[PDB]
Amino acid sequence: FVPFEGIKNDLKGRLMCYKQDWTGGFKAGFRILAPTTYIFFASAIPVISFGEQLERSTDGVLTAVQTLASTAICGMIHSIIGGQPLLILGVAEPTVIMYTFMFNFAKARPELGRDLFLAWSGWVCVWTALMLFVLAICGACSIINRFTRVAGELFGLLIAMLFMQQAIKGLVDEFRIPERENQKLKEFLPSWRFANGMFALVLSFGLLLTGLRSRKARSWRYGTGWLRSLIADYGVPLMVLVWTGVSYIPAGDVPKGIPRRLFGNWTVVKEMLDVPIVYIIGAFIPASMIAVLYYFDHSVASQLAQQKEFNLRKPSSYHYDLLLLGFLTLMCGLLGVPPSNGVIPQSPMHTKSLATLKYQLLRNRLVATARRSIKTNASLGQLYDNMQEAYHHMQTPLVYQQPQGLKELKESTIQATPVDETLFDIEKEIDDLLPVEVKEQRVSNLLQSTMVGGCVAAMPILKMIPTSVLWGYFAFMAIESLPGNQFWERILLL
């Protein structure tokens, strides 16, 4: 717990894999788009829902534009100078709850009111940034190492329950009347309300089930490998588009709003000095709560994306990441947008998608090399050496760790068997000798953040998405927030 020690160590570690990060990201060509698109959807949909929730709960002060811009800018800055580019930054539910509490507090004060809410929030963000700077400088993130696997599994389960509760609440609200829309409307009759609720159930469950099914496309006996990979990669975005199209089928026999549909930044510094100084000090309290929450969430989200099972080859940056989070919180407060923060399950989902990308790249390369070798000599031990050489050649040269390397050829595999091709199937055998590796780089995070930003200018296209799609996706992400963690497995076994 020495001042500035952790930050300096983290910077030392990360500054020697920076150009490597960028060149590795560019090494993959357009194949980097699949994880990028997957994480872009996973980041944009919850943020848009949170933006709608804040617009309803803040009388139009904060909308989806602000949440999207915060997510995009914070993500881009973290991608370029972050320290741990696996982390995905976004506006989380606890932030929404705290901002709702703050808005409710400020609406009941004649001194603050509604036209000074953003300025008071900015002062809260200044206090939070100061607290985060103090915590990072003192190495308070060292206690993160102490928290064990259960301390992260419980948080994952809590986030899963929160996402499921959000999905169920959205589905139930599809059955009720909104508190802001015109009450005397054709689309809001009890019969049409029941119809809307049932249609939303159909669409949400259809999206959930089809996406969960298409997530297993690669392990199918039908179709071609190209089509199987395309489905396994883009099924959830494709399902979003397909169920959006399905929602338009009955449009010739229903009222306008059946089903219900969805719908830069500025500065608040000038009016930030108009807040009386009894609430600038009073911002310390919600600032303390938000600082503790962010200290916990950023760290746990970063460590859940850095599981030992992924065999990552680059160091962690907990202290430096917390310092940068302080800076980003200060910037977001000055810009009048809610702060971003490391979020789950987006971060582990990003890590898993990158691991899958590396696995597929390696499988393609090794299959090609094995097929090339089968024709020439194919001695089954000289071909394994060729595959090992290709694996080593593909890898990126670093200084910290070394590539895991292909694992041992199983005794049963050799006992079963130049090499006879009838008795040695490459597709069956490659999977048995591929390690778990992650394609670590900064390009996927940067592109996902830029896409989230461009969603700001793509609002008319976003106007065509029903909210049932959002609730189905929230359920899909809640299930993704327990992708087979040890704690959930143990609960299943009991």
Author numbering: 5 to 267, 278 to 431, 440 to 516
Cite, word for word, the article reporting this structure.
The Arabidopsis thaliana Bor1 (AtBor1) transporter from clade I undergoes slow regulation through degradation and translational suppression, but its potential for fast regulation via direct activity modulation was unclear. Our findings show that AtBor1 is regulated by two distinct mechanisms: an autoinhibitory domain at the carboxyl terminus obstructs the substrate pathway via conserved salt bridges, and phosphorylation of Thr410 allows interaction with a positively charged pocket at the cytosolic face, essential for borate transport.
The protein yields of these mutant AtBor1s were more than 10 times lower than wild type, but we obtained a stable protein sample from an AtBor1 active mutant (R637E/E641R/R643E) using LMNG detergent. The densities for TM13 and TM14 are disordered, so the atomic model was built to residue 516 from a dimer structure at 2.77 Å resolution and a protomer structure at 2.55 Å resolution with robust side chain densities (right). Importantly, our AtBor1 occluded structure resolved the large intracellular loop between TM10 and TM11. The phosphate group of phosphorylated Thr410 interacts with this positive pocket, which is also well-defined in the IAI structure, even though the intracellular domain is not resolved in this conformation. Further comparison with the IAI conformation revealed an upward shift of Lys372 by approximately 5.4 Å due to a fold switch from a β-sheet to an α-helix.
